[PDB]
Design a protein around this nucleic acid. Structure first.
Lengths: 70, 70
DNA sequence: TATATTGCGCAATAT
DNA sequence: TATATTGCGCAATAT
């Protein structure tokens, strides 16, 4: 339209749209950051699992003969 | 509204834009799905770490004054 | 003469 | 009389 109330409401909506779009950009960046954090924690936990496995293999490899006197 | 070539170019761009925006929506869904998958794998790995801890503590808890005949 | 992506406004809709 | 979100077109830009 062309009324003065129309122009002010449009100006305000354009402001809100810019704000909402900027907020969505920040959310998407936060989602990317979360993917990186979970990937790092996944690699930490998997290395921890493997570490425990390697320490148990060495614990069983050398164990071979637990004394059986009789 | 410059020419007939203008109208066809705009029609083709509107098609491309709708396609591009749909592709972005599917990409964002893929990122959400990835977050869920990493979250599930992180819970599986943390449970595995805790299981290995519990099986080690109970192993050494029954371990007591293991023979030292001197 | 091609499609793909993106900042912006609009209008409809949602809160 | 409020802002927030979203489908769509436009024009500029990128590939």
């Amino acid at each position: 339209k062309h009324s003065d109330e129309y122009k002010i409401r449009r100006e305000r909506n354009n402001i809100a749209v810019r704000k909402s779009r900027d907020k969505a950009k920040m959310r998407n960046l936060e989602t990317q950051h979360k993917v990186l954090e979970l990937t790092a924690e996944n690699e930490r936990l998997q290395k921890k699992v493997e570490q425990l496995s390697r320490e148990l293999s060495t614990l069983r490899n050398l164990f071979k003969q637990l004394p059986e006197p009789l």
